[PDB]
Amino acid sequence: MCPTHADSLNNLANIKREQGNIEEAVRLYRKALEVFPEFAAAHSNLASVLQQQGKLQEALMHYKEAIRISPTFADAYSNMGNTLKEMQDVQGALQCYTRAIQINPAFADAHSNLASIHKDSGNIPEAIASYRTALKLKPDFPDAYCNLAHCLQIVCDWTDYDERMKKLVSIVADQLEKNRLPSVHPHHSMLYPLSHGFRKAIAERHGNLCLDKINVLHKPPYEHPKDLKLSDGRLRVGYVSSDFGNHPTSHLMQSIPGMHNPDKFEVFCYALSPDDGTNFRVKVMAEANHFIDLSQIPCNGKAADRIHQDGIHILVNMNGYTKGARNELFALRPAPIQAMWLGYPGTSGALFMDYIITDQETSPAEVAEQYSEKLAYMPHTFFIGDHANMFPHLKKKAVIDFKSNGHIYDNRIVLNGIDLKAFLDSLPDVKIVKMKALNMPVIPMNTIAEAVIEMINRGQIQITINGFSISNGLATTQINNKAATGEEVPRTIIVTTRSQYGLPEDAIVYCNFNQLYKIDPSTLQMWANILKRVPNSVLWLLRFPAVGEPNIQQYAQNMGLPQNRIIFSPVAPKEEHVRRGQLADVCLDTPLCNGHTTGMDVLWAGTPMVTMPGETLASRVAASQLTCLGCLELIAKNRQEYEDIAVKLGTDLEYLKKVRGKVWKQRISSPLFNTKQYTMELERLYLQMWEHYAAGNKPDHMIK
Amino acid sequence: FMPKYSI
Numbered sequence A: 001m002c003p004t005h006a007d008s009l010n011n012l013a014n015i016k017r018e019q020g021n022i023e024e025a026v027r028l029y030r031k032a033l034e035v036f037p038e039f040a041a042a043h044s045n046l047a048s049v050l051q052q053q054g055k056l057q058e059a060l061m062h063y064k065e066a067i068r069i070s071p072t073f074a075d076a077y078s079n080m081g082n083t084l085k086e087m088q089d090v091q092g093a094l095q096c097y098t099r100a101i102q103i104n105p106a107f108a109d110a111h112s113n114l115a116s117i118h119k120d121s122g123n124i125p126e127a128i129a130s131y132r133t134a135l136k137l138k139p140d141f142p143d144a145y146c147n148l149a150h151c152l153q154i155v156c157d158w159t160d161y162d163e164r165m166k167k168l169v170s171i172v173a174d175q176l177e178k179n180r181l182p183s184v185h186p187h188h189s190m191l192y193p194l195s196h197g198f199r200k201a202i203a204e205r206h207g208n209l210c211l212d213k214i215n216v217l218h219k220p221p222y223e224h225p226k227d228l229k230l231s232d233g234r235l236r237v238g239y240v241s242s243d244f245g246n247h248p249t250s251h252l253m254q255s256i257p258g259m260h261n262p263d264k265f266e267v268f269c270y271a272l273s274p275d276d277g278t279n280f281r282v283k284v285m286a287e288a289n290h291f292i293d294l295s296q297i298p299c300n301g302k303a304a305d306r307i308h309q310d311g312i313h314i315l316v317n318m319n320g321y322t323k324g325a326r327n328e329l330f331a332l333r334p335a336p337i338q339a340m341w342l343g344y345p346g347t348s349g350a351l352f353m354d355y356i357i358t359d360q361e362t363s364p365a366e367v368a369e370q371y372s373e374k375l376a377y378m379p380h381t382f383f384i385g386d387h388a389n390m391f392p393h394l395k396k397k398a399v400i401d402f403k404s405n406g407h408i409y410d411n412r413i414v415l416n417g418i419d420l421k422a423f424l425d426s427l428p429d430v431k432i433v434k435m436k437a438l439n440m441p442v443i444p445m446n447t448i449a450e451a452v453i454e455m456i457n458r459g460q461i462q463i464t465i466n467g468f469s470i471s472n473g474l475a476t477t478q479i480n481n482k483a484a485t486g487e488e489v490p491r492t493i494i495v496t497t498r499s500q501y502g503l504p505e506d507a508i509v510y511c512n513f514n515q516l517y518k519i520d521p522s523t524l525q526m527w528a529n530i531l532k533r534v535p536n537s538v539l540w541l542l543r544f545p546a547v548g549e550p551n552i553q554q555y556a557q558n559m560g561l562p563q564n565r566i567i568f569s570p571v572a573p574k575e576e577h578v579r580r581g582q583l584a585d586v587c588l589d590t591p592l593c594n595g596h597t598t599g600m601d602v603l604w605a606g607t608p609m610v611t612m613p614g615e616t617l618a619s620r621v622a623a624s625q626l627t628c629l630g631c632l633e634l635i636a637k638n639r640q641e642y643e644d645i646a647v648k649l650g651t652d653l654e655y656l657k658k659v660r661g662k663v664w665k666q667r668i669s670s671p672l673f674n675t676k677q678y679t680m681e682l683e684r685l686y687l688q689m690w691e692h693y694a695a696g697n698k699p700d701h702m703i704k
Numbered sequence B: 001f002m003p004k005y006s007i
């Protein structure tokens, strides 16, 4: 028992640890502590690498020791905090970060970690404040800088945007050289002008964090099936998601498990989340051949084992680097074929993923170098939505003519309803506007139209007309919470109007209902150019989040736009959100990162969407959606072409009518919203993947 | 549930 004996072991181990051999670092640190038990720095370092190994309970014990031994050890409080955060004790993490800060007001990391808790909780201003404090205290601090950058992206603070982008690139480049974990998150990397090489490298380094956490389990390779004989000629497909519940992913693909053909497929849904009580979870549970709640099996070893016992041929990763992911499951390779699908719009960058399911428009061969996976092409778009099932009440609209001697508009006052035809047939006088199968009933301004308008204007919940229930589209939540979320189809007729959202009755409405983080200065310039060329037009955006609004309005004033040219509405429930798209004339897609779910949402309302596909997967989805829809005239080769298409749609009301009618027809007539066709194509593709493997081949691009 | 303006 000696202090400088133990001191030497600690330095040998920071060495092994620096190299990257985590496993030896531990054995050294542990000998250091047998030699000198009261060695604060050893306890703290052992704890740090136990945390990396995902042995949180044990890490936490050693942090506690470090603190007992050295009570001024701010650093150990800060990392104990992080351990508690990963353990879901955000309460206890918070106490750690705050205690660090009281003991050493000048200690930057605790300020940064306090900011991350705020950021995770949606408190973006509180996060910005604490990241700024960390950077005053320690101006070279990449973690703090890159998280502040994402906070600023979220609220559309573009102060020193180009200089900031230049510095994020600079930090990633330095961190990839110096072999550290990059401070830019792979999901965020799509937003910054990094190289395809850098984005893939960022992904790959996040993938390797899974390898550290599964190497501690010391499991051997699994024996994979070589044939379909034990599964009766059925291919066993395992869908793995944290999002079988009320989450966009489920709003896209909840119908698909149920649409698989039982003669050739056996469907396993592996949920990483507990049952949130919603119908989305009910449906996947009810319709999958097998539903396994892996939230009840927190050990990645035992969960991977469970996948392997079920005999899965193709395991499908629906999370990539999103909240709730357990990529450890995939790193353990319990299945012989492992595919990225739908939920993550980027590469895993990881050796443990074989294919990415995409399409020729989204992921053309010229840009294959950005993916670590082999391309597996679906015939049209990889994108899909459940809109035909969730929102069939929007398959048909009717309007009210209130101008009377004026225009018959398709989007100022709109009725939708499963029982709309019956309500219309009860009315005396209904003009039917043919659409040069399809037609738009027009309620003229009788006293019934006045009663509907009265309801909208007095802000009443609902009225009754000839026994039919007529709902104010702002009150869906009070009438039927389940209809509001998309869990139920509304059983009332819903009225939606521009007057509800403060949209001008006599103007072109350009919408974008994405989260504001997808907007960059260039995009708002493009939009300003369009608005300047189409007088009285407005841009319709969401408080997504609200603190973004003042920032965008400021950048818009500096571009010479009066305040009233951009109209902000609150985020709404799913069904109001999709329905009120019917009020727009055109949707202006964000080129930096496209609307994904949001794209399918505007197209379901028959709202034409203008996009400029970039190079990233995330920047090409809207074009892929539109080529499948069959509207190639809405895809721009550059900013000039985008502005021109938008301006044409706003100035040439005959062209607008034609293109809106195209989208309105083709949402039904094209493959885009056809879940049965989608599922059958996904099945054709699964079988290619499998035949290729059965013939004894390593994975290769599937383009035919 | 008021509208921003009157039709």
Ligand SMILES: O=c1ccn([C@@H]2O[C@H](COP(=O)(O)OP(=O)(O)O)[C@@H](O)[C@H]2O)c(=O)[nH]1
Pocket (backbone or CB within 6 Å): A247, A248, A251, A513, A514, A515, A542, A570, A571, A572, A573, A574, A575, A577, A594, A595, A596, A597, A598, A599, A601
């Ligand atoms: O007012 C709104 C705006 C959007 N959404 C929904 O919020 C989710 C946003 O998800 P995300 O940002 O992932 O959109 P994506 O990137 O897929 O377009 C989508 O399901 C939208 O339907 C909503 O319910 N109300």
